[PDB]
Amino acid sequence: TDRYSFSLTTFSPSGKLGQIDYALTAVKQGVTSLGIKATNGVVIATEKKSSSPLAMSETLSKVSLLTPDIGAVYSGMGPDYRVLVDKSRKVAHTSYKRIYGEYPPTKLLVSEVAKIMQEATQSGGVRPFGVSLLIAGHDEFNGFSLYQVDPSGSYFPWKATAIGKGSVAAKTFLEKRWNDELELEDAIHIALLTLKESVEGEFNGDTIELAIIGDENPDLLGYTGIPTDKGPRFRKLTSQEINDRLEAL
Amino acid sequence: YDRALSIFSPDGHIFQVEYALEAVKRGTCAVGVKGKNCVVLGCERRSTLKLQDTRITPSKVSKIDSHVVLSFSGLNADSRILIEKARVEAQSHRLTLEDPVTVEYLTRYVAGVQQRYTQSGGVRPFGVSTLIAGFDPRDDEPKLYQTEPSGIYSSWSAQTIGRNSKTVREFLEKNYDRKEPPATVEECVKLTVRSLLEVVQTGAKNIEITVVKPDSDIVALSSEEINQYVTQIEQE
Amino acid sequence: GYDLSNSVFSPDGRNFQVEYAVKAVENGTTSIGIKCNDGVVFAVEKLITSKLLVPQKNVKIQVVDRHIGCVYSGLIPDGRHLVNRGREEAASFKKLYKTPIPIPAFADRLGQYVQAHTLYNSVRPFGVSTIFGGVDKNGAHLYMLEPSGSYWGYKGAATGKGRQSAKAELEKLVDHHPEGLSAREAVKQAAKIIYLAHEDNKEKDFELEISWCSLSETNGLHKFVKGDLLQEAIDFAQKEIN
Amino acid sequence: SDPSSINGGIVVAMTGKDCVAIACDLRLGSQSLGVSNKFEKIFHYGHVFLGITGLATDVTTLNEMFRYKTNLYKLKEERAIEPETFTQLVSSSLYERRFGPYFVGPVVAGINSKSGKPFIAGFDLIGCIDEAKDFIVSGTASDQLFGMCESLYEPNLEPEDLFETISQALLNAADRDALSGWGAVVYIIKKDEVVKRYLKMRQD
Amino acid sequence: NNYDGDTVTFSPTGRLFQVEYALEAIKQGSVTVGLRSNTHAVLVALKRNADELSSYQKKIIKCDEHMGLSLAGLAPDARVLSNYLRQQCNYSSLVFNRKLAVERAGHLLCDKAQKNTQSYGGRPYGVGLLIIGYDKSGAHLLEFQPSGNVTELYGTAIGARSQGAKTYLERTLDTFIKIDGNPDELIKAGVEAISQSLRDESLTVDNLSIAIVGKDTPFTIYDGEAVAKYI
Amino acid sequence: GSRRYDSRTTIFSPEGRLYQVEYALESISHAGTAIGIMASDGIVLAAERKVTSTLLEQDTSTEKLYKLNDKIAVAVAGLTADAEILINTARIHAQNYLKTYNEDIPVEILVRRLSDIKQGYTQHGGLRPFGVSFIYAGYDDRYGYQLYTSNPSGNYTGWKAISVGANTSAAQTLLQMDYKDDMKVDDAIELALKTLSKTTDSSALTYDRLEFATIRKGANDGEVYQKIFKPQEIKDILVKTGIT
Amino acid sequence: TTIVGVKFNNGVVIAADTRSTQGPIVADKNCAKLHRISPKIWCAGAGTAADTEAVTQLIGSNIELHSLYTSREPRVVSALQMLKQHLFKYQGHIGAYLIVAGVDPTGSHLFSIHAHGSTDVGYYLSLGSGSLAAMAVLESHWKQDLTKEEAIKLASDAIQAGIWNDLGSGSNVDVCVMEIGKDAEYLRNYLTPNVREEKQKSYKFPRGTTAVLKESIVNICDIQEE
Amino acid sequence: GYDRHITIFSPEGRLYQVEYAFKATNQTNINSLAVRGKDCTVVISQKKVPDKLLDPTTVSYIFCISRTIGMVVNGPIPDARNAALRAKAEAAEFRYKYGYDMPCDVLAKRMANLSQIYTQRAYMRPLGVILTFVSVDEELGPSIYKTDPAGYYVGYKATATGPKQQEITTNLENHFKKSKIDHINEESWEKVVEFAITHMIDALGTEFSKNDLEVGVATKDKFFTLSAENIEERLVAIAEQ
Secondary structure: OOOOOOEOOOOOEOEOOHHHHHHHHHHHOOOOEEEEEOOOOEEEEEEOOOOOOOEEOOOOOOEEEEEOOEEEEEEEOHHHHHHHHHHHHHHHHHHHOOOOOOOOOHHHHHHHHHHHHHHOOOOEOOOOOOEEEEEEEEEOOOEEEEEEEOOOOOEEEEOEEEEOOOHHHHHHHHHHHOOOOOOHHHHHHHHHHHHHHOOOOOOOOOOEEEEEEOOOOOOOOOEEOOOOOOOOOEEEOOHHHHHHHHOOO | OOOOOOOEEOOOEEHHHHHHHHHHHHOOOEEEEEOOOOEEEEEOOOOOOOOOOOOOOOOOEEEOOOOEEEEEEEOOOHHHHHHHHHHHHHHHHHHHOOOOOOHHHHHHHHHHHHHHHHHOOOEOOOOEEEEEEEEOOOOOOEEEEEEEOOOEEEEOOEEEEOOOHHHHHHHHHHOOOOOOOOOOHHHHHHHHHHHHHHHOOOOOOOOOEEEEEOOOEEEEEOHHHHHHHHHHHHHO | OOOOOOOOOOOOOOOHHHHHHHHHHHOOOOEEEEEOOOEEEEEEEEEEOOOOEOOOOOOOEEEOOOOEEEEEEEOHHHHHHHHHHHHHHHHHHHHHHOOOOOHHHHHHHHHHHHHHOOOOOOOOOOOEEEEEEEEEOOEEEEEEEOOOOOOOEEOEEEEOOOHHHHHHHHHHHHHHOOOOOOHHHHHHHHHHHHHHOOOOOOOOEEEEEEEEEEOOOOOOOEEEOOHHHHHHHHHHHHHHHO | OOHHHOOOOEEEEEEOOOOEEEEEEOOEEEOOEEEEOOOOOEEEEOOEEEEEEEOHHHHHHHHHHHHHHHHHHHHHHOOOOOHHHHHHHHHHHHHOOOOOOOOEEEEEEEEEOOOOEEEEEEEEOOEEEEEEOOEEEEEOOHHHHHHHHHHHOOOOOOHHHHHHHHHHHHHHHHHOOOOOOOOEEEEEEOOOOEEEEEEOOOOO | OOOOOOOOOOOOOOOOHHHHHHHHHHHHOOOEEEEEOOOOEEEEEEOEOOOOOOOOEOOEEEEEOOEEEEOOOOHHHHHHHHHHHHHHHHHHHHHHOOOOOHHHHHHHHHHHHHHHHHOOOOOOOOOOEEEEEEEOOEEEEEEEOOOOOEEEEOEEEEOOOHHHHHHHHHHOHHHHHOOOOOHHHHHHHHHHHHHHHOOOOOOOOOOEEEEEEOOOOOOEEEOOOOOOOOO | OOOOOOOOOOOEOOOOOEHHHHHHHHHHHHOOOEEEEEEOOEEEEEEEOOOOOOOEOOOOOOOOEEEEEOOEEEEEEEOHHHHHHHHHHHHHHHHHHHHHHOOOOOHHHHHHHHHHHHHHHHHEOOOOOOOEEEEEEEEOOOOOEEEEEEOOOOOEEEOOEEEEOOOHHHHHHHHHHHOOOOOOHHHHHHHHHHHHOOOOOOOOOOHHHEEEEEEEOOOHHHOOEEEEOOHHHHHHHHHHOOOO | OEEEEEEEOOEEEEEEEOOEEEOOEEEEOOOOOEEEOOOOOEEEEEOOHHHHHHHHHHHHHHHHHHHHHHOOOOOHHHHHHHHHHHHHHHOOOOOOEEEEEEEEOOEEEEEEEOOOOOEEEOOEEEEEOOHHHHHHHHHHHOOOOOOHHHHHHHHHHHHHHHHHHOOOOOOOEEEEEEEOOOOEEEEEEEEOOOOOOOOOOOOOOOOOOOOOOEEEEEOOOOOOOO | OOOOOOOOOOOOOOOHHHHHHHOOOOOOOOOEEEEEOOOOEEEEEEOOOOOOOEOOOOOOOEEEOOOOEEEEEEOOHHHHHHHHHHHHHHHHHHHHHHOOOOOHHHHHHHHHHHHHHHOOOOOOOOOOOEEEEEEEOOOOOEEEEEEOOOOOEEEEOEEEEOOOHHHHHHHHHHHHHHHOOOOOOOOOHHHHHHHHHHHHHHHHOOOOOOOOEEEEEEEOOEEEEEOHHHHHHHHHHHHHO
């Protein structure tokens, strides 16, 4: 049968939808991840944790690509994000690659993903996902943007933000380092320095995942010879390069 | 989803019916009196708070036809759905069968909406009681019915539903005859007014009067028209 | 707590609804299966609750395909439905690939099916263990299927109240023939250990049924045992227990 | 027969320098009866203009289709849709129908306010982005237009040289079309203000 | 309310409790007794009126001229099974130009009930059937439990005080099988069998309802002053 | 089971009242204030955010204000997240009216529709309602400017001025005492700001905590031009009314 | 049109023309007929134009997904396989005559695919209406194991022959060279063999040489404050 | 409470129902060990046959999903066959629509999503088995991916499973710290089998037989299983080292 079509999100007798509050707790049990928005790029960073010392963090992806020019990174539950990134990609393709053809604006896509969060707080047999996403991107219309998607199904633009267990400390860190004008390089230094205080293990560049949605790079597209068309503004930094960056904090 | 909200109660009742009738008590209050040449449905309008426009506050009396109206007591949210559904059925009769609707037709239709959600599981019925009033075309007899969210209908010749229906009923016992309605429209209007001034209160602010006369005559009377009648009532 | 559905799980790592279903078959009939070299021999104890019954009319042995024997114990209506589904599976395979389904293939499919009803609170599990086997071009096979959805290879298997009595004798029978043994001789064996597992059913009386699938006699089809061969087996088992 | 060529209709469009122009005839008929001398085929969403040719009913049904979609874009992003993204949209929405497909040709003309450039593109029954920086024509006398346009055109026109050109092309084609004629209107599109000018034309 | 409010939950006793409750409908319910020889089958049912100004209720349903069923439990549950058996029997005549066999119709019925007890929100049917019929194999007499399981007998009973009726049939067991070609004797013996099931429910000529099927006899229900040939 | 894990959430109570709706009104009082006032030249929508953080960008936050169509906008008070779904349903219903009738949707119709969805959640499906309250600014040609407030139960009530969100009591009374029916857009712009500064959840009302928007009939020909002000223009008008 | 694809040991070259005809009417002088299923997987299209363009849009999305899922270079035959199945159930009512080219870490590849859902391999393939004219010239000069430069030429010349003996082929010849283990090199307008001859006088007129009926202004630049 | 009975969060943000799924793979007492060789990937795993009356040849914890990808399962056997089936369907699926055999990486990711979907419903029981996929791919080289009930997966240099798998893990970690590369060097896959056995014997403290082991080997473009005889050959070669 099917008798689970009663929502598993409810209100509490003291107001405040209780289920999404619990789901927001799981983010404070999650890993720390942060995004600093520059005025000529965006940087996102997260820490890799595994349950084994024989585990490969070379086939572990916590920063994932949605479209060349837009990246995402989570804090919270792994499994939840693993399915949710696939649904983000799927709606972006079915509604903006088969209808509007080109890669969406950042603002558009953020709204669309928040609708799926919303539709896991409406129906039975589904309770919501317990991660928060930072979706960094650039469109040529609204410029650089950094957004944060809630487990409530809302979005917020931020100037700089963190999510994870060390989020509260991190936004206090960013207060004094932040400035309305930043370079992309300086952003890298600020981002990794804040995340060093939100990791209580050892802080390597082999176990720290770095990505920029900063400079275009054409040769990562797959072809060259038309410069009006580029390749990905997303660019993941390999490990040895990140090690160079640890020295640049 | 089919996990019932309608579940048999140990008294030969259903939880959702009993609750629906509670919601009718707690809600707006409608009085219906029929003359020999009219129906009057008056209902509590909710505008008690100060600085409200009453052209965009919910209609408590809605015309379904050119001579059949629908009034209600109970919740104010559950009721709009039924208004919309009644209109469709009226237009359907007129499309496929012909003949501006009869009041009786619509009385049974509204009760037939109540029965579905009671007897089915996974749904709950509307907490709305209705006064269905009007005329049959080609007949000059006015007709006053009530339906309640149980799905029952009964004819009356005066009726009240909603808050303090006991109070309103007792007033109408001495000043109304079951076998001789009013013979004048103005007296039917004034009798419905006198009942609403018991519970509702506070002038003619929250009073409504809709009048239907035969020949397909619907008029709505604004509150300022009702003031004039009220002063005569007090003087008397 | 943890005893109200089949999609709770305990901190112990145990599902009790599912475990509890094995107890259903434990109050069922005794049924045995001897894995041979040429085939398989099933036998099933049929309890007699009165003498108004008509013996060898009340079937627990249903054939699935033209070559797979199935006999089951536990809650009877449930087991008849499990066989019901499996006949549909037989026809489907035949339709697409134009050959009768193999013995391992059938075992596979039933395992999936019994899995499905312990994964939802909207269907009820089964209450039967089934014993089935046969001959195909990969050889003779024997399988027992739990209501958990578990099966294995089986040299010999049993279930029912007297599964203990049965299995103890099967161990000794592999001592007698560590090279396995012939189907034809295993008919007499099959009776023997139901009589031994009727010493746990010794406040009742019984009817013996035997069925076989063997490549050396019946040309690899599943048939019943009856007539002269049957009464030879009945006589054998009697004298031994007397 | 074929439904496109019942009412007729032509649309002509030409690029200039940091401007575009789109123009149409006003004739909408059913078959040999001329019905209306007062109808436009040019619509606008934002600052992008859509001229549509072919079958009458599908002219109007697509007008409404695109109005739903371009409202969405706007209310979202708080601004006007770009000519390039409107191109992509038009293509896909034609392909939605394959059985009883569309029997039109839309024409997209605007100015990209992102690089200052003229953009036009063309479409036929089901799609096919027609890229040009010269002119795109469509409709039933598309041949008459194609010839006329090539000869008069010179790369890079000023907005008034451009008015002259597109007008001449339209007139002679429309009076050499049986299903066009009745009046004409030309939008000359600059990026700050658009002038809409009716042409005096033979009544035919 | 753990395992008795759900129809999907086991039970380390290897039960579903609902089935036992559905078998208690038979104790409160009517009684009917079947017995067969090798050439005829017979049902003797105790009809019961609602009061004395009520006609007594028919308890035997004719499914075909070679088949009949009788209830002892809830009537609305019996209404589903009567339709189903008729449907399958007519289907057998249409498709295979066959009578439908007795054993086989029981098997179809068994697996039907099972998948409505499987589905959550369902119910096990609380009516027990005796299904009689005459096919090529001769007579058959099946007992149908609320479990759904079918059993083959020469004589069986269900309902209230069915236990005494099986005593009676086990004693006359070798008598009525070695009477063949006379359906009459079986009916007399069946009256005696259901008299071991009375509680001052008396047997009259309008309480007694007989149904037979033979090789040469259609399915026929005797009622009226025509059951007083066997009293 | 499946009836074993449901306690029945969306039935009536013994006062005829839906558990979930009553809880919802409380959760909307947690969320920031939003006030609507109707001038005889316009409607002013003014909203205070429910979140203001250390480094929250609120300079482009369009997270309370949404244009449903080019004459109807809403102010949001409640869960921003919950509100999303109905905001886009409303866009679709509005565009549909334009598509088939070649005319802009009346305010009445659009609100009545959304209310039906809310009513629909407790009517069927076992589903909860969205804990949202909306204040609608809308223009039509039949009642002119219309002002509406809607609640999570699915009912609409007209107003001349109304408040939702946090501290509705205080705000409502002050609005009654100070509002006159001959006010302008200028007057209403100042009245809204003063009311929001008596209900500010901090100790001061700041330009980046204000979203401010108007629908004005000063645009030519009597057309209504909706304006969602830039963050420098809100700061501009807030020093004018003399809060900061 | 004409599309040539020449496979050789070290890579593959796909070349096409830029003349877009609808009917005998030339839709476009210039148009890019090289399309992108994926950034390494280029094709060009002949036959009807809308159908080629649509199906490469549709399969471009599916492949783009797949490329993200593996996070590495998409295989050519993935595109091949998906096109084939798609077209097969329409039974070729969708006219796509594609030459599908691409490189990947299991070698150089070159395929053709028809409307019905037929696929061929070859070390060179040609499709469209001008395929025939291209063929001849290729088969004389072609060798096993061409140089990349040599292959460039031979491709461009084959399209050139299309211009001269086919009426769907014309204006510009573009080439894309895809080599294993590098980036695809898009050589737009590699050979421009035809200019519009010069005219002898310019076509200006003074104003109002066309009559004008009336005029109005029409504003889209925004909406209005007061 | 009842956030521990269905998969809905607690005031910690934790799904207790999901955590329990891990706790059941110790109940069959099966250990596995899988290491990447030089040109192969070897997985050796326990085989429990507690009786005669179980036929040992049939007792298999090794299911071939692809031609090239083996799967070894630790935990309850119903869920093992269920998981194997889903995975087999999906592998075939991808071969049909993408024109090559499904990558090991992508198959691991696939089962991770499906696992998450079984914890997304509130009446679906997570599949409690822990799955090891071993392959030699032509793009990723030797690979091990271990997926788990929650729907988390990550690549692996080597891995172990079972109630006693900490000990095994300790051994392997130390080996790759001396060697300083992520795969064992040798050059005959046979000797990588032998090495794997030695570490296993050290870890669990018990020497194994040819019917206490069942061995699977993936070389290039292939997966097969060793028979019980081949395994006895290896145990002689322990003597020979």
